[PDB]
Scaffold this active site. Structure first.
Site, short mmCIF file in Angstrom:
data_model
loop_
_atom_site.label_atom_id
_atom_site.label_comp_id
_atom_site.label_asym_id
_atom_site.label_seq_id
_atom_site.Cartn_x
_atom_site.Cartn_y
_atom_site.Cartn_z
N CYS A 1 -5.98 2.72 -5.61
CA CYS A 1 -7.28 2.12 -5.86
C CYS A 1 -7.13 0.70 -6.43
O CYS A 1 -6.44 -0.13 -5.84
CB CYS A 1 -8.12 3.06 -6.76
SG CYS A 1 -8.31 4.82 -6.10
N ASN B 1 0.86 -1.18 0.00
CA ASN B 1 0.00 0.00 0.00
C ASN B 1 0.90 1.22 0.00
O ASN B 1 1.49 1.56 1.03
CB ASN B 1 -0.91 0.00 1.23
CG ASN B 1 -1.93 1.15 1.24
OD1 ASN B 1 -1.71 2.22 0.65
ND2 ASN B 1 -3.03 0.93 1.93
N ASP C 1 -5.34 -8.92 -0.54
CA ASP C 1 -5.65 -7.65 0.13
C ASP C 1 -4.30 -6.98 0.37
O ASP C 1 -3.72 -7.09 1.45
CB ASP C 1 -6.44 -7.89 1.47
CG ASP C 1 -6.86 -6.59 2.16
OD1 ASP C 1 -6.44 -5.50 1.74
OD2 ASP C 1 -7.63 -6.67 3.13
N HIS D 1 -12.28 0.25 0.35
CA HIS D 1 -11.11 -0.62 0.30
C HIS D 1 -11.20 -1.57 -0.89
O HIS D 1 -12.24 -2.19 -1.11
CB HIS D 1 -10.96 -1.41 1.60
CG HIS D 1 -9.67 -2.16 1.70
ND1 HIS D 1 -8.46 -1.60 1.34
CD2 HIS D 1 -9.40 -3.42 2.10
CE1 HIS D 1 -7.49 -2.49 1.52
NE2 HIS D 1 -8.04 -3.60 1.98
#
Ligand SMILES: Cn1nc2c(=O)n(CC3(O)CCN(Cc4ccc(-c5ccco5)cc4Cl)CC3)cnc2c1-c1ccc(CNC=O)cc1
Length: 334
Positions: A13, A8, A269, A252
């Site tokens: 996005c 991240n 994720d 998220h």
């Protein structure tokens, strides 16, 4: 899981989701490894940057960074990804890597994997005039509002539109004419990228459509083709589910994959990759009741599945590139 995540590093996005999806398009990955990027300057080269991300995703034990890649194609500002759709980024990426494959032994890999053909027609109702034109496509945007499943989306997408009144068709020598407009599918590609239309304009801002929208594990598409083939029916297997949770930009992004196409699903994720059930990749992402749902689906044509998911080894990465990237690491370590 044997799979590694991506870091991240800002509001990118859909980006990490799309990167995992493209990385597990194994045939694409191998073609990307073959690209002649020896002369490229690293600060400016998107093909080298995708080569690097894929190499790391294939060897690294820690989450993979993406900063060189976003620099290379120039989406570097706080909201650069919030201002584009996932298919626009995919286009930027695949256009770069196919322009790099021009003149090489892997030229045409991108058209071969992702391009299909359709026909756009206008048939005049009151005179004899039919205008046909072939368009290529790499992705399909499917309307979901008021549609229960993918099937009704495909029906709505091929449905006839009427041209008349103050919107009648200019048939040239025939002047203004009443007509019907529509598209048929002539070819469906081996890898099928379907965006769902969940991000819309309200009577005056943008809103998320969280309605329930069912998509199947196995998708038969024969009946939306102009002419079928008995030897190769248009049956597709679900490969990726890109998911957004939330009703606004504070939401998220995650992606569910069965990378091998064998029904064993993982949740990607960002930096966490974990085993997950089939219900959680598919039904739990239908929407309806919450705010968690799919906005993009990847399908593979069953008849091409094994060729698109062909095993990748480390003897598939040319040694020139392994050397360049390991030298990059070695300079990073000093
Ligand atoms: C209508 N339409 N919807 C779309 C959509 O959803 N996608 C998926 C995303 O690209 C966008 C939403 N992301 C998830 C999200 C992130 C934030 C918010 C939000 C809501 C309120 C505040 O923040 C809502 C969502 Cl759903 C994830 C990627 C892609 N294309 C869409 C189109 C479209 C239809 C025709 C054309 C013409 N092309 C050819 O003719 C071009 C685009």
């Amino acid at each position: 899981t044997g799979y590694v995540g991506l870091k991240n590093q800002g509001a990118t996005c859909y980006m990490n989701s799309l990167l995992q999806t493209l990385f597990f398009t194994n045939q694409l990955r191998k073609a990307v490894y073959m690209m002649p990027t020896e002369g490229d300057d690293s600060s400016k080269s998107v093909p080298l940057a995708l080569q690097r991300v894929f190499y790391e995703l294939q060897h690294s034990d820690k989450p993979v960074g993406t900063k060189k890649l976003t620099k290379s194609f120039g989406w570097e500002t706080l909201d650069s990804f919030m201002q584009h759709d996932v298919q626009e980024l995919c286009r930027v990426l695949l256009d770069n890597v196919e322009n790099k494959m021009k003149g090489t032994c892997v030229e045409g890999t991108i058209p071969k994997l992702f391009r299909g053909k359709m026909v756009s027609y206008i048939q005049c109702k009151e005179v004899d005039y039919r205008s046909d034109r072939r368009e290529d496509y790499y992705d399909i945007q499917l309307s979901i509002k008021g549609k229960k499943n993918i099937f009704e989306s495909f029906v709505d997408y091929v449905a006839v539109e009427q041209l008349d009144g103050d919107n009648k068709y200019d048939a040239g020598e025939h002047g203004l004419q009443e007509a019907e407009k529509g598209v048929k599918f002539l070819t469906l590609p081996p890898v099928l990228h379907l965006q769902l239309m969940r991000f819309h304009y309200d009577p005056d801002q943008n809103i998320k459509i969280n309605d329930r929208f069912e998509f199947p594990e196995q998708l038969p598409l024969d009946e939306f083709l102009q002419k079928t083939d008995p030897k190769d029916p248009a049956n597709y297997i679900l490969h990726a589910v890109l998911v957004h949770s939330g009703d606004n930009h504070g939401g998220h992004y995650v992606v569910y994959l069965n990378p091998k196409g064998d029904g064993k699903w993982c949740k990607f994720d960002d930096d966490v990759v974990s085993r997950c059930t089939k219900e959680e990749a598919i039904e739990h992402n239908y929407g309806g009741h919450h705010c968690t749902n799919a906005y993009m689906l990847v399908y593979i044509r069953e008849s091409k599945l094994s060729e698109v998911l062909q095993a990748v080894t480390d003897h598939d990465i040319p040694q020139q590139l392994v050397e360049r990237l390991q030298e990059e690491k070695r300079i990073e370590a000093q």
